[PDB]
Design an enzyme around this catalytic site. Structure first.
Site, mmCIF file in Angstrom:
data_model
loop_
_atom_site.group_PDB
_atom_site.id
_atom_site.type_symbol
_atom_site.label_atom_id
_atom_site.label_comp_id
_atom_site.label_asym_id
_atom_site.label_seq_id
_atom_site.Cartn_x
_atom_site.Cartn_y
_atom_site.Cartn_z
ATOM 1 N N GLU A 172 33.211 39.895 53.233
ATOM 2 C CA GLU A 172 34.625 40.195 53.458
ATOM 3 C C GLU A 172 34.826 41.700 53.613
ATOM 4 O OE1 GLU A 172 39.031 39.100 51.636
ATOM 5 O OE2 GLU A 172 37.200 38.372 50.665
ATOM 6 N N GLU A 186 45.910 28.281 51.923
ATOM 7 C CA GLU A 186 45.168 29.311 51.208
ATOM 8 C C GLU A 186 45.001 30.573 52.041
ATOM 9 O OE1 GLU A 186 41.696 27.673 49.583
ATOM 10 O OE2 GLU A 186 40.947 29.562 48.681
ATOM 11 N N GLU A 197 33.157 24.957 44.272
ATOM 12 C CA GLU A 197 33.270 25.999 45.285
ATOM 13 C C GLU A 197 32.823 27.344 44.732
ATOM 14 O OE1 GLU A 197 37.019 26.167 47.325
ATOM 15 O OE2 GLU A 197 36.717 28.305 47.667
ATOM 16 N N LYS A 250 29.290 29.676 45.680
ATOM 17 C CA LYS A 250 29.331 31.120 45.870
ATOM 18 C C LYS A 250 28.331 31.824 44.963
ATOM 19 C CE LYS A 250 34.107 30.880 47.348
ATOM 20 N NZ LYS A 250 35.461 30.652 46.785
ATOM 21 N N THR A 262 51.231 27.113 40.555
ATOM 22 C CA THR A 262 51.499 27.457 41.947
ATOM 23 C C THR A 262 52.450 26.467 42.605
ATOM 24 O OG1 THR A 262 49.525 26.284 42.763
ATOM 25 C CG2 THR A 262 49.286 28.614 42.191
ATOM 26 N N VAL A 317 54.869 31.534 41.432
ATOM 27 C CA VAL A 317 53.572 31.898 41.999
ATOM 28 C C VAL A 317 53.208 30.890 43.080
ATOM 29 C CG1 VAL A 317 52.488 30.732 40.041
ATOM 30 C CG2 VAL A 317 51.111 32.239 41.504
ATOM 31 N N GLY A 321 39.313 30.326 52.307
ATOM 32 C CA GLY A 321 38.956 28.969 52.690
ATOM 33 C C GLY A 321 37.454 28.873 52.887
ATOM 34 N N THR A 381 55.162 25.801 41.409
ATOM 35 C CA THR A 381 56.454 26.331 41.011
ATOM 36 C C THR A 381 56.792 27.562 41.837
ATOM 37 O OG1 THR A 381 56.013 28.045 39.371
ATOM 38 C CG2 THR A 381 55.518 25.772 38.732
ATOM 39 N N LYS A 421 49.862 31.193 44.612
ATOM 40 C CA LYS A 421 48.412 31.191 44.706
ATOM 41 C C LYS A 421 47.857 32.028 43.566
ATOM 42 C CE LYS A 421 44.568 32.386 47.745
ATOM 43 N NZ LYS A 421 44.093 33.153 48.924
HETATM 44 C C1 LIG Z 1 36.777 36.372 45.351
HETATM 45 C C2 LIG Z 1 35.859 35.580 45.887
HETATM 46 O O1 LIG Z 1 35.851 35.041 47.171
HETATM 47 C C3 LIG Z 1 36.984 34.816 47.952
HETATM 48 C C4 LIG Z 1 37.325 33.355 47.822
HETATM 49 C C5 LIG Z 1 37.510 32.502 49.079
HETATM 50 C C6 LIG Z 1 38.224 31.182 49.019
HETATM 51 O O2 LIG Z 1 37.648 30.176 48.569
HETATM 52 O O3 LIG Z 1 39.390 31.128 49.460
HETATM 53 C C7 LIG Z 1 37.493 33.153 50.450
HETATM 54 C C8 LIG Z 1 37.254 34.642 50.493
HETATM 55 C C9 LIG Z 1 36.483 35.236 49.350
HETATM 56 O O4 LIG Z 1 36.573 36.631 49.487
HETATM 57 C C10 LIG Z 1 34.608 35.230 45.114
HETATM 58 O O5 LIG Z 1 33.650 34.681 45.731
HETATM 59 O O6 LIG Z 1 34.558 35.513 43.893
HETATM 60 FE FE LIG Z 2 38.864 28.506 48.357
#
Ligand SMILES: C=C(O[C@@H]1C=C(C(=O)O)C=C[C@H]1O)C(=O)O
Ligand SMILES: [Fe+3]
Ligand SMILES: [Fe+3]
Length: 368
Positions: free
Chosen positions: A175, A219, A354, A358, A118, A123, A192, A120, A125
């Site tokens: 989302e 992001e 992160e 999730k 990224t 891409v 984010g 470069t 992201k």
């Molecule tokens: C696709 C995913 O989540 C996305 C990832 C996020 C991020 O860290 O930027 C924010 C929105 C989410 O919809 C996931 O949890 O697998």
């Molecule tokens: Fe993120």
């Protein structure tokens, strides 16, 4: 709840389904054009459904991250509305194998290669992902996981989708990809994240550091700028705040920009959802480029993960949310999913943790 039943909980429309009139596997590729085989086959099916007695037929189900693949949509025999408020108030597991796909070191190396790419031009992201595959010793009651899921996530878009393989798609998504409610549509992309802190000052502070985070905001602008453009060509009114606001889930803070627009005469929930999907919150930017990285680096296929789940009715109304904070269960097997958007400021271990937070949402549901 019978595992053979669609369940959708939302501030907009919350309903369950019973039965099955017709399944619909047509791939949603090019579903943004009405001339597409998808949209034509969809209208012919609604028409067939009304012809055969189905009052107000509705299309529910899930579309994979890559809509060149078959869809998991179907029209039920009937549907039942319920109060989300009311549901918000009225609501063993032996393990036999556990595996992370991929494990920690391989994932951090994946993030690192993508964050390098990224930096470069080709891409900007990439959304990389990992899973946790769990086998149990028995069949899983999806109806009870659901009650647990709503309790822990009383506010998100919670869904339970029967699948053509005897499995279920289950999740508490935060989302919204596309709501259509007349000629007006909304969309609230997220991008984010920041762990919520148990103390309300650490929490409020965590939320402020997020709004100040240059990494998490780059992001984000990458996502809104892509959609702003796609929708500019197809809307007449379109309101997009120049900056994001904050929202919450029991595990995370997120950054949100609410989209509001008016749709041309021959749009519907799905034409518009197929337009935006997948957004750079799920695939990356540019779309194809990031999709080539995901394929170069992900040692699985997301299938339904990172797709969309929701419903579209005969009259164009609908809602579609991103298939995340979710799990595919089938008999005695479970597969969870979490992705994360990589940018040149992405930390290999930062993203591993992160995607980890999730997964904690579905893990909280399985008591793990
Ligand atoms: C696709 C995913 O989540 C996305 C990832 C996020 C991020 O860290 O930027 C924010 C929105 C989410 O919809 C996931 O949890 O697998
Ligand atoms: Fe993120
Ligand atoms: Fe306006």
């Amino acid at each position: 709840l019978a595992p053979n039943r669609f369940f959708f909980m939302s501030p907009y429309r919350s309903f369950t389904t019973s039965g099955c009139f017709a399944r619909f596997d047509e791939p949603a590729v090019n579903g943004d054009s009405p001339d597409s085989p998808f949209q034509q086959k969809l209208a012919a099916l609604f028409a067939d459904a009304k012809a055969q007695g189905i009052k107000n037929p509705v299309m529910v189900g899930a579309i994979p991250f890559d809509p060149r693949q078959p869809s998991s949509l179907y029209i039920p025999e009937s549907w039942q509305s319920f109060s989300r408020q009311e549901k918000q108030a009225s609501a063993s597991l032996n393990v036999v194998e556990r595996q992370a796909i991929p494990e920690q070191t391989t994932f951090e190396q994946m993030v690192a290669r993508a964050a390098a790419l990224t930096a470069t031009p080709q891409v900007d992201k990439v959304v990389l992902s990992r899973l946790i595959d769990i086998t149990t010793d028995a069949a899983i009651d999806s109806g009870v996981l659901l009650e647990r899921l709503i309790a822990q996530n009383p506010v998100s878009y919670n869904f339970h989708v029967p699948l053509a393989d005897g499995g279920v798609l289950l999740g508490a998504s935060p989302e919204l990809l596309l709501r259509k409610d007349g000629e007006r549509f909304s969309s609230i992309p997220l991008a984010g994240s920041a762990r919520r802190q148990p103390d309300e000052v650490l929490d409020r502070e965590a939320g402020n550091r997020l709004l100040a985070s240059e990494k998490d905001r780059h992001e984000h602008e990458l996502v809104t700028q892509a959609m702003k453009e796609v929708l500019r060509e197809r809307s007449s009114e379109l309101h997009v705040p120049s900056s994001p606001q904050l929202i919450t889930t029991p595990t995370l803070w997120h950054l949100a920009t609410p989209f509001e627009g008016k749709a041309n005469s021959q749009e519907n929930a799905l034409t518009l959802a197929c337009l935006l999907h997948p957004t750079p919150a799920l695939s990356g930017f540019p779309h194809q480029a990031a999709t080539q990285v995901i394929a170069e680096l992900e040692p699985f296929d997301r299938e339904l993960f990172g797709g969309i789940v929701g419903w579209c009715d005969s009259e164009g109304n609908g809602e579609w949310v991103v298939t995340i904070r979710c799990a595919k269960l089938r008999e005695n097997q479970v597969r969870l999913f979490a992705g994360a958007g990589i940018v040149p400021a992405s930390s290999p271990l930062g993203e591993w943790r992160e995607t980890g937070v999730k997964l904690s949402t579905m893990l909280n549901v399985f008591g793990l």
